[PDB]
Write a protein that binds this ligand. Structure first.
Ligand SMILES: *[C@@H]1O[C@H](CO)[C@@H](O[C@@H]2O[C@H](CO)[C@@H](O[C@H]3O[C@H](CO[C@H]4O[C@H](CO)[C@@H](O)[C@H](O)[C@@H]4O)[C@@H](O)[C@H](O[C@@H]4O[C@H](CO)[C@@H](O)[C@H](O)[C@@H]4O)[C@@H]3O)[C@H](O)[C@H]2NC(C)=O)[C@H](O)[C@H]1NC(C)=O
Ligand SMILES: *[C@@H]1O[C@H](CO)[C@@H](O[C@@H]2O[C@H](CO)[C@@H](O[C@H]3O[C@H](CO[C@H]4O[C@H](CO)[C@@H](O)[C@H](O)[C@@H]4O)[C@@H](O)[C@H](O[C@@H]4O[C@H](CO)[C@@H](O)[C@H](O)[C@@H]4O)[C@@H]3O)[C@H](O)[C@H]2NC(C)=O)[C@H](O)[C@H]1NC(C)=O
Ligand SMILES: *[C@@H]1O[C@H](CO)[C@@H](O[C@@H]2O[C@H](CO)[C@@H](O[C@H]3O[C@H](CO[C@H]4O[C@H](CO)[C@@H](O)[C@H](O)[C@@H]4O)[C@@H](O)[C@H](O[C@@H]4O[C@H](CO)[C@@H](O)[C@H](O)[C@@H]4O)[C@@H]3O)[C@H](O)[C@H]2NC(C)=O)[C@H](O)[C@H]1NC(C)=O
Ligand SMILES: *[C@H]1O[C@H](CO)[C@@H](O[C@@H]2O[C@H](CO)[C@@H](O[C@@H]3O[C@H](CO)[C@@H](O)[C@H](O)[C@@H]3O)[C@H](O)[C@H]2NC(C)=O)[C@H](O)[C@H]1NC(C)=O
Ligand SMILES: *[C@H]1O[C@H](CO)[C@@H](O[C@@H]2O[C@H](CO)[C@@H](O[C@@H]3O[C@H](CO)[C@@H](O)[C@H](O)[C@@H]3O)[C@H](O)[C@H]2NC(C)=O)[C@H](O)[C@H]1NC(C)=O
Ligand SMILES: *[C@H]1O[C@H](CO)[C@@H](O[C@@H]2O[C@H](CO)[C@@H](O[C@@H]3O[C@H](CO)[C@@H](O)[C@H](O)[C@@H]3O)[C@H](O)[C@H]2NC(C)=O)[C@H](O)[C@H]1NC(C)=O
Ligand SMILES: CC(=O)N[C@H]1[C@H]([C@H](O)[C@H](O)CO)O[C@@](O[C@@H]2[C@@H](O)[C@H](O)O[C@H](CO)[C@@H]2O)(C(=O)O)C[C@@H]1O
Ligand SMILES: CC(=O)N[C@H]1[C@H]([C@H](O)[C@H](O)CO)O[C@@](O[C@@H]2[C@@H](O)[C@H](O)O[C@H](CO)[C@@H]2O)(C(=O)O)C[C@@H]1O
Ligand SMILES: CC(=O)N[C@H]1[C@H]([C@H](O)[C@H](O)CO)O[C@@](O[C@@H]2[C@@H](O)[C@H](O)O[C@H](CO)[C@@H]2O)(C(=O)O)C[C@@H]1O
Ligand SMILES: *[C@@H]1O[C@H](CO)[C@@H](O[C@@H]2O[C@H](CO)[C@@H](O)[C@H](O)[C@H]2NC(C)=O)[C@H](O)[C@H]1NC(C)=O
Ligand SMILES: *[C@@H]1O[C@H](CO)[C@@H](O[C@@H]2O[C@H](CO)[C@@H](O)[C@H](O)[C@H]2NC(C)=O)[C@H](O)[C@H]1NC(C)=O
Ligand SMILES: *[C@@H]1O[C@H](CO)[C@@H](O[C@@H]2O[C@H](CO)[C@@H](O)[C@H](O)[C@H]2NC(C)=O)[C@H](O)[C@H]1NC(C)=O
Ligand SMILES: *[C@@H]1O[C@H](CO)[C@@H](O)[C@H](O)[C@H]1NC(C)=O
Ligand SMILES: *[C@@H]1O[C@H](CO)[C@@H](O)[C@H](O)[C@H]1NC(C)=O
Ligand SMILES: *[C@@H]1O[C@H](CO)[C@@H](O)[C@H](O)[C@H]1NC(C)=O
Ligand SMILES: *[C@@H]1O[C@H](CO)[C@@H](O)[C@H](O)[C@H]1NC(C)=O
Ligand SMILES: *[C@@H]1O[C@H](CO)[C@@H](O)[C@H](O)[C@H]1NC(C)=O
Ligand SMILES: *[C@@H]1O[C@H](CO)[C@@H](O)[C@H](O)[C@H]1NC(C)=O
Lengths: 321, 162, 321, 162, 162, 321
């Protein structure tokens, strides 16, 4: 008669690594790394993202006529922009402090567009001939829908002095711009005045822009350039515009109604028609694992990202052959 | 392993013990079979469960990357940003992989320890009333029926009685 | 007869955590995390800090008349500035490269103010009417005490050409500024000359400022703006000022006599009348522990900061019930 | 614990042994009492003291935050600065907490090891001149007076004499 | 050490055993000498070799500094860059030194464990056919010639034969 | 008769550290930290570095006449520049976005210099009197060899309108500059035209420079200043220069033929005449160790840098006295 002490074995083939030995077969183990995703862009917690498609943040905000889809976008969870969107600035130029603006959007979930300077209000200047073939719409020459490219009326561009006061409760994003003409002749041909300026002032801001003449290469068939600027006009503050030519004036401006967590995601993917609680640029995640290896940039309640191919913890013991 | 029991003086585990991690096998005139030791098994389940939750929760607060964009003449800070984001990922990847390696080794040893301790517990009861065979088994000098076997598993094996 | 082997137990209730088990009672333990502070701002190693109180680094350096307390400050250990000091730039405007200057102060423990261009020396210009109601002092209109707001004399602002040479052994911090008038009429009303400039040159520096006219909102009851600039004038170098209007001229400038470790601390607290060897924005620290959890930004010989609530090491063994 | 002694086959510690961490309890016709084993106790004090100082000194060089300010259009680098400062704090917090967890477990096991080793040291002297009771005690076959007891603590217990 | 063998109940190593880390020394009427135990020695070589390679390869992906220059009015970001580069160096220095400390302790204990396990392997064969001297040696009750000695090293020592 | 179990000892004095004990003697150990270097700058993998010696990246690229050694440099592996090179900008001034350019060079292994605007082509302006005593060559006044300092011819500086088109397959680095004169008289004395400008345009670029008059301290015996600018002209794009004075025109420009891994190393050392697979600013490394403690900034296939004085792993066991 005898009694023996012993331990469990089973048909398990699961393996774990240790410092001294690799591929040790154990009776039980626990994977802790999420390796799969669904491969789609999805609603985050019910709230659908802003999918800019072929448009960029600039084309959207300035109102590129190819981006009418996004003329009044509802509240978003995150934003998806391609690496090289084709519909950026249709009329060539620059967007001043573009990155600092984009960064500001990671704190924003919803804009509401409102009119601050009506297009009809320009009685001393021509407001309806400010278009170009570089920004086409339905076969015809058009322009960024949110700003007004003003030119002379009856061969006269008298000084503009307009002032908007933010009576709204919410911070206001205002956009304007300046046009750089090609040569000394085009300046007179559009604005008449040979030397021009644009002065912009708020409580903080103190700006004075001057157009710069230079021989440029054609971009989208245009030698002229547009340089766009921006500010956040606080509540109860007023913006002041004075200019005598080359002024791209505000028509519409966006109210910042909702702030909070958001992000601009870089992805070529399109809407998955789908829901998730954790999203990556490559697809969504649904798992209870503490780690994943899909992609570092995520949004939502996610596991922690690591560059591992494999993380498996032993729970049971060394299994017998 | 460090404690010499698992794949040591006990050469292999038992496919036939399904109700626990560690236990006893008996054989006598009435028959034979396996019986799990519930106390040491449950201690093992608690240790390992706490360990896993400890590992999960320590990696709870950990670096998170954010999207940041830079223009063509901000190449230096763009690169700084990249090296920073990457640097932290490598640090946390290292932490995670090493922790798993180290604690896996400790988990296997823990099981080995529990088996040795159970073996010694029985050895210290039986004392010189049984032959220590050298393979995890004790052969009795007296007939040991199922009641006798149960008392060895009890902690009750009445040594002076035999 | 028998002999037994055993181990210590005592009445200890101290507990430590391990990977597999929490709240294990041990016979002895050692706390290594400092959790307390005295809640005061204190002298660091005998040397008292500069407590700016309601003033800011700008109000101090430019010499805001509300900041006479800090007109000749002795050597400091660290500096304490509030989050939103009320006495900043009394006359509205900007301070150019303000942050880069503040950063320069973390390397500085002592300034010595000296006069470089005496106020009486302005014989062709009016130097004693450069004041505003936005910068009041004892009921009357005053101005930043370290710079001179020059205006025309007998309806004439002739070109200024003044030059200071740093014959001191020590690097010199020089401050000056430009005034932006409200409109074309105010320019003539103060300086007469319609188009003005300020040119500043050193061995390195090559500057030319032009005033910018724009319609501004009132800030502290003033529509005009002041924009302040600075440089470090090296030993044996000379600064050169040429201008024909809108010039805010140096009166006093600070010598950098002592360099070394310092910091600008953000705190609403006031002087504790107290001494310490390690200071935080929330209070001082006196302990021999290797760690603390008070606040990350410290100055002096401190323990290392961690976000832990608890760090306790086992020294003794598992204690018996 | 891993070594099976503390809260194992030795069920509990002794309130009555105040002069050391590990030691002996004897009882015979002359009386009874506790005596600390100084050598193993002092080895333990040295190991643990070195450990604490090692832990302190390894965390000696460690990240330090500095105040840096940024204007309203330097939001990106301000945020970079914040993520960098925070990232390192989380790394060092993790390092500190994990080290304490891991070394605490090792410290408790170290004590268990020292107790088992002391028990085996005595077992290997007594050999078959005493009964191994199974609870940390050895009952002698011969009368063992205080001189006899002292020789067990010595390392001198003259086995062939009894 | 934790396992009580090395510099424990076996007081010192053997200058005279050159062909292995662990083994046997025998003496009888025919003579005496040392013989390495190849199996436990080779297990030890494999464990330690894997460990070293594991340590090397885990520190394979690790932070790398890059040269970046800044002008006189980029002092803040220059400093940020410096604190970032330095911060990571300190993190990796800490990781490396701690890993070596921790794994060195484990490596010494591993050797102690292998020695104890080899000692127990022999103890469990000999059983009551030899006296356990208490210093690593077993004195036989019967004459044990070189063939007999070899069978102890074999795992073959025929207990019922003696 | 007896059999004994035991373990190895030898004459080893090698020591390792553990958490609980320091200087434990072991039978075998393995050092893993490389502590030595050869103390030389060496060829990396056969490919020799660019050793600028007393010249700087600016002096080199602009073509300081003291840097003729580097007039047509072959492909390099890395670049070595001193901390304070003496031959920087011989004529005092600035190099615009100098750091961003240097950073661009860490991605570059080889330039090929080509001529874009021949020096002889300036028929309306004097191109051979643009020299200064601050940039001497063989006892005579010279100038940066890659740019042309243009002055008036027969008391006339007519408007310049020149345009280069990048027909090369490779991105082109173009350098130009502007001269800031001392006073109103020197402007006329060199360029005649009192008010001047330089306008530069590409597909992206839209620049307009104006010279700035100011009283400067002498640097290298000159009060005037030169401010140098740059751009990368893409394939098939054209750069456009228009100016009426103060123009420092391109003569030569560098083609970017080879991209890849490189670095600007800071070192006072000179060429070791030597080869290595891993280089530091203090010397080269040849070892199979996983770590080193020489210097953090390395190039090539290197061990990992740590600040340790000592890393030694136990392999064998505790050795006996
Ligand atoms: C853009 O437009 C907006 C709105 O159209 C402008 O905001 C308004 O600015 C004017 C000043 O230009 C203010 O007028 C009066 O404000 C205070 C109100 O004081 C208290 O009473 C109200 C009523 O309950 C309360 O809501 C306030 O919170 C406050 O407690 C008047 O007292 C003030 O008149 C004063 O009288 C005092 C004693 O009689 C004198 O000592 C003072 O010197 C002063 O004369 C004045 O008439 C509006 O209040 C203000 N609107 C709001 C909602 O705040 C905004 O200024 C404009 N921006 C720009 C840049 O122009
Ligand atoms: C701001 O003001 C300060 C002080 O008022 C100016 O510093 C001074 O600048 C002048 C030049 O403008 C220098 O004048 C003489 O300097 C050297 C001195 O040479 C040696 O001898 C002295 C005496 O022991 C010693 O301390 C020096 O360290 C040095 O070793 C004279 O030699 C020089 O004259 C020369 O003679 C040589 C041979 O005879 C010629 O080859 C030279 O070409 C030259 O003519 C000259 O007269 C002052 O030395 C200098 N002060 C100090 C303390 O250095 C500063 O220039 C000014 N800044 C600006 C921007 O204007
Ligand atoms: C700097 O100089 C360079 C070279 O000197 C300039 O590049 C050249 O720019 C001109 C336009 O100004 C182009 O001219 C013709 O280009 C296309 C070629 O189209 C295809 O065929 C060629 C031949 O195999 C192929 O290699 C191309 O890849 C392409 O597939 C012509 O078709 C075009 O004429 C068109 O005809 C169409 C139908 O007949 C019309 O619809 C179009 O509207 C258009 O009239 C034109 O004649 C050169 O091709 C181009 N060189 C190269 C190598 O690409 C460069 O523009 C200049 N820069 C600046 C800023 O000025
Ligand atoms: C562990 O196991 C031992 C041995 O199996 C247990 O002892 C046995 O316990 C059983 C059940 O309680 C006893 O049965 C009783 O018998 C008496 C009269 O003989 C009867 O009046 C009761 O109704 C009951 O049937 C049995 O006597 C006893 N046998 C022996 C050999 O001791 C022990 O109780 C167990 N202990 C623990 C801590 O689990
Ligand atoms: C550890 O303890 C043992 C047993 O207690 C020690 O042996 C005893 O040592 C004492 C004190 O040295 C001896 O006393 C001596 O007795 C002789 C004559 O009997 C006398 O001439 C001396 O003046 C002294 O009083 C005693 O003989 C001895 N007893 C026995 C039973 O051995 C031993 O010395 C200790 N060893 C160590 C390493 O601590
Ligand atoms: C380990 O060692 C034991 C004891 O040394 C080995 O047993 C011995 O093995 C030898 C060599 O195989 C045997 O020699 C043979 O003898 C027979 C007749 O006596 C002869 O016909 C053969 O040609 C050969 O010479 C020997 O009998 C035997 N001795 C004893 C006492 O058992 C054993 O084989 C070894 N086992 C292992 C697993 O290494
Ligand atoms: C508001 C206005 O002047 N719109 C014009 C526009 C601008 O004058 C010009 O873009 C300012 O730089 O020019 C348009 O015509 C272009 C010509 O100016 C150019 O010489 O050639 C172009 C063809 O590639 C084009 O015809 C335009 O943008 O289409 C006409 C527009 O009404
Ligand atoms: C040196 C000087 O001119 N000082 C004036 C000052 C300036 O002219 C003005 O601030 C430049 O922008 O203006 C003072 O008067 C102010 C009026 O100019 C303004 O229209 O209304 C103000 C009331 O909110 C104020 O009266 C001033 O700053 O107080 C008078 C000062 O002597
Ligand atoms: C192209 C040209 O004008 N070259 C002149 C040069 C420049 O006029 C000047 O550097 C522009 O700022 O000046 C040279 O002469 C210098 C004098 O202008 C100066 O007053 O004193 C200098 C002595 O320290 C020097 O003589 C020059 O750079 O050498 C003459 C050169 O041809
Ligand atoms: C441990 O097992 C893994 C998984 O099977 C091995 O990884 C494979 O290695 C083979 C070569 O032996 C490669 O051809 C495969 O690409 C690997 N497969 C996978 C799924 O990764 C690994 O080699 C083993 N490691 C050791 C040390 O034995
Ligand atoms: C270990 O003990 C700590 C300290 O008592 C426990 O922390 C408390 O937990 C209770 C709930 O059990 C909470 O209500 C208290 O807020 C906690 N008190 C403090 C001071 O932190 C902890 O729960 C215990 N942990 C485990 C795993 O048993
Ligand atoms: C362990 O040994 C090292 C190396 O010998 C010791 O380091 C020396 O310490 C002495 C003082 O004891 C100093 O004077 C030397 O500068 C050190 N030499 C070297 C080469 O570093 C160290 O002190 C010993 N550590 C312990 C804890 O005993
Ligand atoms: C392993 O055994 C389990 C019994 O629990 C059984 O369900 C499973 O099918 C088996 N798998 C294999 C591959 O044998
Ligand atoms: C997530 O995956 C789980 C499987 O773990 C599955 O039950 C479920 O379908 C998924 N949940 C959601 C909300 O998509
Ligand atoms: C614990 O015991 C110690 C004796 O060393 C005594 O000083 C202390 O008062 C006791 N504390 C409690 C709470 O019993
Ligand atoms: C610091 O605290 C200690 C207690 O640990 C105390 O003795 C002393 O009063 C304090 N020292 C100083 C200098 O404030
Ligand atoms: C140590 O012993 C080895 C034998 O392997 C010998 O080669 C060496 O010379 C010895 N060194 C010393 C210092 O004794
Ligand atoms: C590198 O050092 C090794 C010694 O480890 C030596 O054999 C050799 O000379 C060196 N190799 C080269 C390529 O310099």
């Amino acid at each position: 008669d005898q009694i023996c002490i012993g331990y469990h074995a089973n048909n398990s083939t699961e393996q774990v690594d240790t410092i001294m030995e690799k591929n040790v077969t154990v009776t039980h183990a626990q994977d802790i790394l999420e390796k799969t995703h669904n491969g789609k862009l999805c609603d985050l917690d019910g709230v659908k993202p802003l999918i800019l498609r072929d448009c960029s943040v600039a084309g959207w905000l300035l109102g590129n006529p190819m981006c009418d889809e996004f003329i009044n976008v509802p509240e978003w969870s995150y934003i998806v922009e391609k690496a090289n969107p084709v519909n950026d600035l249709c009329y060539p130029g620059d967007f001043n402090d573009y990155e600092e603006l984009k960064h500001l959007l990671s704190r924003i979930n919803h804009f509401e567009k409102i009119q601050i300077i009506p297009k009809s209000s320009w009685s001393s200047h021509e407001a309806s001939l400010g278009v170009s073939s570089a920004c086409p719409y339905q076969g015809k020459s058009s322009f960024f829908r949110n700003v007004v490219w003003l030119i002379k009326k009856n061969s006269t561009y008298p000084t503009i002095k307009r002032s908007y006061n933010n009576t709204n409760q919410e911070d206001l994003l205002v956009l304007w711009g300046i046009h750089h003409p090609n040569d000394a002749a085009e300046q007179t041909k559009l604005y008449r005045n040979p030397t021009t300026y644009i002065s912009v002032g708020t409580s903080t801001l103190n700006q004075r822009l001057v157009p710069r003449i230079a021989t440029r290469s054609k971009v989208n068939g245009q030698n002229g350039r547009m340089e766009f600027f921006w500010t956040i006009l606080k509540p109860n503050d007023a913006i002041n515009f004075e200019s005598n030519g080359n002024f791209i004036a505000p028509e519409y401006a966006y109210k910042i109604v909702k702030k909070g967590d958001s992000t601009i995601m870089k992805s070529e993917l399109e809407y998955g028609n789908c829901n998730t609680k954790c999203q990556t640029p490559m697809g969504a995640i649904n798992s209870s694992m503490p780690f994943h290896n899909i992609h570092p940039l995520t949004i939502g309640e996610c596991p922690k990202y690591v560059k591992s191919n494999r993380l498996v913890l032993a729970t049971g013991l060394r299994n017998s052959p | 392993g460090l404690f010499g029991a698992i794949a040591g003086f006990i050469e292999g585990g038992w496919q036939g013990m399904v109700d626990g991690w560690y236990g006893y096998h008996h054989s006598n005139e009435q028959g034979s079979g396996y019986a799990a030791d519930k106390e040491s098994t449950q201690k093992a389940i608690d240790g390992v469960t706490n360990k896993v939750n400890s590992i999960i929760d320590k990696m709870n607060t950990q670096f998170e990357a954010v999207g940041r964009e830079f223009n063509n003449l901000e190449r230096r800070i763009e690169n700084l940003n990249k090296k920073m984001e990457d640097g932290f990922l490598d640090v946390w990847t290292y932490n995670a992989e090493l922790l798993v390696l180290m604690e896996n080794e400790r988990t296997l040893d823990f099981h080995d320890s529990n088996v040795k301790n159970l073996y010694d517990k029985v050895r210290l009861q039986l004392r010189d009333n049984a032959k220590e065979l050298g393979n995890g088994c004790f052969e009795f000098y007296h007939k040991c029926d199922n009641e006798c076997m149960e008392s060895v598993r009890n902690g009750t094996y009445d040594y002076p009685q035999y």
